[model samples]
Target chain A: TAKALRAIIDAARRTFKFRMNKIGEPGSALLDFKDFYLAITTDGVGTKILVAEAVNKFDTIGIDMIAMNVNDLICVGAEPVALVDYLAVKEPNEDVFQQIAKGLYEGAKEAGIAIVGGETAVMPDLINGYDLAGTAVGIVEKDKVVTGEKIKPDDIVIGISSSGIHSNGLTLARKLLIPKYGLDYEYNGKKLWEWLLEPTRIYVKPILKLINEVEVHGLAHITGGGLLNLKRLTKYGFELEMPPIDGIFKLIYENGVPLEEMFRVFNMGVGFMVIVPQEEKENALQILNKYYESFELGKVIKEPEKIKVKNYGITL
Target chain B: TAKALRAIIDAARRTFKFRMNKIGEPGSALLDFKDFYLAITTDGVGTKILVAEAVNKFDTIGIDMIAMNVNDLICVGAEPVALVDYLAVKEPNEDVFQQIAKGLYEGAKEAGIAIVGGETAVMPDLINGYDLAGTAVGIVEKDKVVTGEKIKPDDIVIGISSSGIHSNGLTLARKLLIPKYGLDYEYNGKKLWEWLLEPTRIYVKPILKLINEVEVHGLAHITGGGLLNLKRLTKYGFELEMPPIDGIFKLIYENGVPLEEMFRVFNMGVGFMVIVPQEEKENALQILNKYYESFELGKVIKEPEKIKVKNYGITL
Candidate 1:
């Protein structure tokens, strides 16, 4: 469903390719500036905001909004420097507004980026509750941009663990879980709403550090399209020995989201992935482990141009 | 209403200021990058999208989205280079999506910027028709940034004609005009919907040209807050000899909107304004006139930090 929707948007984008700095990358849009390359990426909280509205938990959605865009920028090897938010709501509610702002502040603080400016639009007819989207700008020297151009066969794939379900796949999760076990449903001593509302993990600092310390071949911010996000890095196939699916994904899968669909939608457990030369894997893992749980998930392979999840028995 | 709404958002933004390049500028957020200044701005088409949905016209709102953002970037003296759109719809209606993309393509072309990337989300319960917003990234030399810092007491205010109402005040306008005259209602041989849906004028090229040719004291892209947008450039009061109100503003005013509220909410025919030294007024007007209708609207005054629309007898 996401691919079909994107295909339509891509078709429409084909006509206005003049002055485009980068093409065919699902990451941020790179514009050729005089001295350096400027990357701009746009993303929203998606149906996750509805979940926030459903549970009256508005603070963390702002984190999810910033993470979605900045994470994409990092995939292109840019350090997210600034962000602007676009929020459309049915009306202005002070409490909800404050909570959203608090979340944005906390998110920006965690990512070590700036929340420069944003737009708050109140539209009664077009918006049901509210929709939050943000655009992030990141900068990179012209020669330093990591476009996944160096990924080669035999490169190691390192996985960075996610915090629960992260941001994407909430649409399907809501449909499957809400009816059976509403937002208040509990798992492992925590309300399902709390788990689902977990803010997306920002890999900006860790990833940027790793890129600087090691020769990073490619990076992937696993989001709505799941493992397929790695395709942006290179045509080389990925052979994965996946980690144990997080409990949130297990619950969603046991609740009837097919294992294959589960791999296709949710980040499962890995929020980010780094592909580096096999010899540099230890160095990369050492740097990434200091920030988050990092481990060897697989290796880059030549030819087939597909991602295989060995543990889940799925190929995407 | 708009001021009250902005206050709430401002309260939220107070907490996060860590690498913020510029503060308290109501236009785009300027970030301090290594070698240059990067300007990022976010804006949506407002309730104008509802008009597009009502008339089943989707192409123009994309232009409004880009104009709303890029115009704000220019107010800070940044050359808009890249844009990413955030489109949330109830579902993927192919024709609606295509038309919106067509408009975005056309808008980017007119603005001389690239549509680098965008997000298209399908949310059945959260969105009524669609909401369109975008973030535009612009670059300026460290020394070339225009922040209205140079506006002195005698700086001349140059007014540029708006293409009708542009993109703001649609909520009030629709509420007033749609009920009494309907979307198909006629005004000056054109349907009310057509007049309301006219794409926003992009002042990027003209303003960038004028800034290169003459010194600009301050620049303001008159948007949702009407002339109050001038506050971003300077603290001086504006003493104006206002232009004749546009026909569309006259209609909204005649329909029951108070003159004061009209100046507070709508553009009232002047879409963009530039504050420059008196010596450069003729040169600024000459360059601006090459693109659109330009005229002298007022002068900067000392003491009070307010904008007074003379003919309308209102201070905002």
Candidate 2:
């Protein structure tokens, strides 16, 4: 565990160093034309595209495209400026393209950003079933960029409830569900198929609403690493006692998946989390609750060696 | 030929309609944003990716991604603002992703744009070796957007030479070369390998220089439909008494490719062409010659039905 964490920390440190060296040079061309520091993020839907194919409705996949990138940008306090999509398919799929474009338009509109441009490639032999990815560019006042520097002992941690599953933990979900439950099976009131295809909820509006009004010190989009993602904000240990994780996670774990695997793989009900000064907790929760269902989960403390999860206490 | 020509016209007309709708909307949300228009283009290295794969120097395909989008954007007189890359691979290939990112970085630098974001996806069964595509955003003053509306009879057509193929028409090139010369053969003291994988030269710099210096009535980026791509700029007919075709085109044509096929598939030495007022011909030529080899390829004619190429006249 230590080795894996060390490798990721080292890689992340190296990645930033490379960016600094490459972009921090005198006359850094990228910084010259644009005022304010631009925060840009690029990511794909990953193996989640496979689940979309099995279900055959990919219009929402475009929403996922915008969600995956924009949700992360707001974590760093950047207002998304524009989004560009890249769709590569085995051939031109007009129906699929139009639907995806519509969803992208909706996604960008909802996120309060513009769909600036995109690339659509018809690679007959190079790809199958189409792949969707996008890049979002955002702007931040240089002094306003959030890096969690103010997180200190007794800083309150708030967890925003996620629309089940969100973006990560799909690979294992597919592995368990497909073989046992079958692709077309229905669970809950909807098709089990559609559940997996749920578009990741966009967090831009709520985050933007809170960013300006509250003294929020840190933000983290709880994705693949679950609670450990909080570590990105600070070296100070976060003693987080999460509320009841959504039912979907329990179902996956009960199907022979280990508890550690659950923590390592899923967001576990919380999609977005924030660290705020304990003094501002009332105002922070007041503003956030207007846009999203959220609660004070725990506090930033001096332990520096633990993440105290409720019940399980999966210490790192 | 008729079916193919009809398809081309249909696609072209739809393309124009798409642009017009976006621009014509009053109080459109798109206009509310800084980048009023969203333009995207996608073209591949034809069979060049195959060559790169064969030689195992797979890194330069990223340059191909940049070239394909940047070249297309210049035809419409737009300056790229941000770029995002899409790389779909059979499996996660870190080397390929790194090389492609490096190439994209270099190409973006040459165009004086920012590498804002990108995506890398690993699809074990859904993709073959790899496919690379990128989307770029560019801004043009609404009034200065060039659509070849001013092209008229006697407008001088200026031709800019290519650096061999510059993407597009590689499918036919491979068809001609592989059976006769084998993949391993050498041509003109260079390995068939290196020539086949020659990266497309990014024309953003030279073309942007031309637009800034002279009143370019219309610009044509010679690609898939070869010389016929000119019709995208204007309704006027063009006559070419002198083609600025290079030696390599002669070699390709000498191998029994029909002249019609030459116009249909390859750029035929002229990678880009522009129409300008007859009086500005010398100035345009002088200024263009500073950056690229220039040629006077006849002029737009009063005749509506002919793009006369010497004795043979083709209609667009």
Candidate 3:
């Protein structure tokens, strides 16, 4: 019932997409200084921290936290320069804070950015376990921004690797796992402990490198919407022949979570998507393949709201 | 029992303060940006929203929310530029969001700031009666950032009029009111219920005018510490020969809360305090007198930890 409700809401949201006109047009001095304006995106690994808390393993959630924000900034063709973290906790826990700091530092190192400053408030009466959220700011040379406006029909879409269930989809996972499997139970022969706490991959370096070396038109970090997130990069439809499906997703699917939700709730497999001109596809792939496994997913097409997923048929 | 615990903790904190170093330490780039960093202190009216909820005065709380953050910021000489709000709800309430938006917009208009951005999260299991917290960033040129550092011996202290209990001491007020007055019961005597909900005044414009037209040396916004917050702005002792206490505070004192606790928590009638060199006292008086009715509270003294009130002295 909840899934159906969500679908209905999602459809309704599609109708109001036109209502989201920028109300107060932002005025930025950067426009006068340079052609490209800096852009930032921020979000926490929502409730993914709960998975770590349930199993008493919190070492990697920080990595997931940073990756979740910075990786998205990279998709828009920006070189992440600085990050500010905000942690609101019910009470101060040195062990948790130390582990989180270490993970954040490691994540920042991977992304080649600095953890400039942060605020850690001890709100004992407010906040639960700990709410880990961060803001990432990046610079993009005016002419270098990949606004996805250049994306056209036949532009090739490329998929990048993901580290297990990198952050999103955990809400549904927790709801399902807790009732079927005890809080501390393991999944897939491995103590579900370490598997569920896997940190999200920081692909800022590789993605930014590709953007610099090749003509990348648009990029999408497969987040809450799974395959459908590709739509955010452009108004045109996307060919839904997903690059590859990891075995873990199959395991999760077998656990009774419906197929459509598999795409709606989880990334399924691919974590990052980049679109480039058809001719530049080979060059982009060559550069991406040097650092990590890459695959040609599909091509941009001139259809509205049509996403044709090869094996699974059409998603939207 | 809680009161006793609080007294003990307060005593211990006083002792700790006595042992700490008194010299200013080097600040980081973050704090060095302002020419004269304005310290804007603000907080939401808290559970006061519950009262607004009861009366269906939704639009008013938005002002309450913005007033909480911006009013506090202006107290310390900062010209508020942007605000970040944290709104937490047990369930997504459109009415609550709309009311909050209206209040915030009105408050921002009062302060002459744009509500740049904010967060609205719905946590069905967490949060009780929606909580609002906002941080307003303001600018004070590096040299102009007033920290009450200029407060010196013989400097005169002036008090600014407050509009009822601004945003502090509410926890205790609610404790007593919910049982006796009832959240919905209107104080028919003089529409005190409506006055209790008056949005905090934004002192930015008037104060900025005072800074230019008057030779104000130091300022303090009376908040959580009540009469004692002046210590934050200066090390010089203060002597209130016959300080005018607000009527609401006297009523609270007569009701049962200890006098010391009343001073420790409520703002009394003085919403803000400014200290000026004796030489500039005339100019300060002339400027502030134009906008607000000013009270000549007392003078700065040599004894650092002494706060000598008429009946009894509060000293560290």
DockQ leader: 1
Q: Mind giving the per-residue lDDT tens digits that candidate 1 earns over A1-316?
A: 4644654467446645555553222227666765667777888888778778878888888889889888988997888777778888887887788788778887777766767677787777788898888887777778888778888899999999988464458777777888889778888778888877888888888998998899988889999788878766897888998888657787887887787777778887899999989999889989999999999999888865888888767888
Ranking by lDDT: 1, 2, 3
Model 2 C-alpha lDDT per residue in residues B210-309, reported as the tens digit of each score: 8898888888878768877886667778888646444556657778888877887788777788888999999888887877788888789887745778
Q: Per-candidate interface C-alpha RMSD?
A: 4.2, 8.1, 11.6
lDDT of 2 by residue, A1-316 (tens): 2332232223222222223333221120122223355566777777667777776676677678788888888888887666656666776655555666666766766676655445455656667677777776665667777888888899999988886454458877887887998877776566666767777778888888889888889999887688777876888887767776456676677788887667667887888998889888989888888888999888888988477675676665
Quick one: best TM-score, which candidate? 1
lDDT accuracy of residue B149 in candidate 1: 79
| Model 2 per-residue lDDT at A135 | 71
Task: Enumerate the candidates' DockQ scores in order.
Answer: 0.46, 0.20, 0.11
Residue-wise C-alpha lDDT for candidate 3, range B1-316, written one tens digit per residue: 2332232223222222221231110131122221233232324455566556556676676666666565656555666655545555566665555556666666666666654443454554345445566544454556665667777899998887766455457657766655765554555343435645565555656677788777777877776678778877777788875454555455456668876677778776777788888787777777777777777788899988577775555442
- Please write out the lDDT profile of model 3 over residues A1-316, one tens digit for every residue: 2332232233222322221232111231111112334444456666777776666666677788778777777776777655555565666665666566667766766776655444454444456566666655555666776778998899898988777565557666666666776655655666554556777678887897898788888888887788777876788888857744555576577788777778776887788889988898789888888877888888888986567787776476
Candidate 1 docking band: acceptable
Quality of model 2 by C-alpha lDDT: 0.67
Candidate 1: tens digits of C-alpha lDDT, residues B245-307: 666777888888887777778887889999989999899999999999999999999966988
Evaluate model 1: give its TM-score.
0.90
